[PDB]
Amino acid sequence: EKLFTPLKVGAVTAPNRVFMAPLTRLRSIEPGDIPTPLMGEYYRQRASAGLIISEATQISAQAKGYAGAPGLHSPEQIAAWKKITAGVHAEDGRIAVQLWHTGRISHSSIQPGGQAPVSASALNANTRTSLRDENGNAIRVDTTTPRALELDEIPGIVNDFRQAVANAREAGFDLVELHSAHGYLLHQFLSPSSNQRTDQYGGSVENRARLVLEVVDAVCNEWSADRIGIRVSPIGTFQNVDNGPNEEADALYLIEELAKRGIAYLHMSETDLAGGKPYSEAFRQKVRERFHGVIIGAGAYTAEKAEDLIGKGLIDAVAFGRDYIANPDLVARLQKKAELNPQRPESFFGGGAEGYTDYPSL
């Protein structure tokens, strides 16, 4: 067994390879998109994870696409997150903040001024997002057609990521994870399906990856490369965003570029929740030889698969999502081969303590 052995992850050392995947739970306070004491308790319960990766967190107000998702742009958000990171650290844990801009997976009613959200191109996501009704309950609503970002707006987006990373450092996070996956803004630029731009930010893979690499460079400069991770979902289709007709070659291009920056980790979300083709070992070897930091695998992993791939030298750690929702002490349960608590999906999004902090430890 290697799941319970330490791993250096950039600036920190994880005591095990069982990571908590980023999980949107939509329990923040509105107005203000403010983390809560309840959220602090939830993360503190899970502090035995080798690394906690937070729920996706807005870099700016414009970044918002879901009612109840937190931000890391305002003073009140920074103050609230400081308490959460302090609670994890009090339990000897480590926590990364996942930073996103939702782009076109959003609704005008939660954008600044009630205006259309932004994207690479003016193409509707053709999906739904989660808003809140008059009683504060989560509801699903069709996405608003976005406005294409103007060329002169792109530096502002890069700056918002830079500033959110500075804020993350002050808030006490150990690392940041850039959300470059699952059809959100960075992936909207990466994918030919969502990017029809004819400037230097669309067309070729070099142009499509330009934004995310500008963001990586800005955040490495702001903090340090050994504090930066990135999540990608570059093989398959995710929330209607595919990866184009040359997905493998394009993925390897992006990974080679990321490696040049010497960042802490590469987190691969391998399949959508609705499933997808498995990664071949040949593709895993190609990824492995191109990236010199930690590789985290995710997507319906079992402990057995994690051990198999870690043992083969193809990945270093595994992020578990739904098992971490239901099992605060997942590390101890996997180590002891204990049964897991059953999942209650109806309370994954929104609500309060029920289905959030009420899954017992052993």
Ligand SMILES: Cc1cc2nc3c(=O)[nH]c(=O)nc-3n(C[C@H](O)[C@H](O)[C@H](O)COP(=O)(O)O)c2cc1C
């Ligand atoms: C309720 C829920 C919320 C999620 N929120 C996020 C998120 O904020 N960021 C992200 O990158 N992935 C998100 N995902 C994907 C998970 O990080 C994870 O990759 C996925 O659940 C597959 O892993 P699992 O089979 O271990 O649950 C979410 C998944 C679920 C079920």
